Write a protein that binds this DNA or RNA. Structure first.
Ligand SMILES: [K+]
Length: 120
DNA sequence: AGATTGTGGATTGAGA
DNA sequence: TCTCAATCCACAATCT
């Protein structure tokens, strides 16, 4: 296994997932839809590194703020479910812009905090 | 068959 | 020097 860090946008995966969910019409998205919407946020995600898609999937399950909503309520073991975000479960500091080489390269193109786009 | 989803074991390494 | 978000991977389902 060859671990590598990539020049991803200077926001946590949690923050970006939460932003796309909260800015969707029904405040819920399938994994496939989350991945498509994240890809539109920054050109990085359209590049040839695709492992971020795995990181997003991992994050949905690992953080308690993301709550699966069954696509079919009679199939609790079905997949392709919707995901929601409970903002009162978000660790607020994970919504701040990160201090990384990417943000230091160009601070002005990155909002300092995503909380205004996630909380009502 | 086939591709994706949902969850977790585990290591990595820059920011702090 | 220590934290934990980032990242790579297996597993075991469903999906097709
Ligand atoms: K979760």
């Amino acid at each position: 296994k060859n671990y590598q860090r990539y020049p991803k946008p200077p926001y946590s995966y949690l923050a970006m997932i939460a932003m796309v969910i909260q800015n969707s019409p029904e405040k819920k998205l399938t994994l496939s839809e989350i991945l498509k919407e994240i890809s539109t946020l920054f050109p990085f995600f359209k590049g040839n590194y695709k492992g971020w898609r795995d990181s997003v999937r991992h994050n949905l399950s690992s953080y308690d703020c993301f709550v699966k909503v069954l696509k079919d309520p009679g199939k609790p073991q079905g997949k392709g479910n919707f995901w929601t975000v409970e903002v009162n479960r978000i660790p607020l500091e994970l919504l701040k812009r990160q201090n990384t080489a990417v943000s230091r390269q160009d601070e002005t193109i990155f909002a300092q905090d995503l909380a205004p786009y996630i909380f009502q």
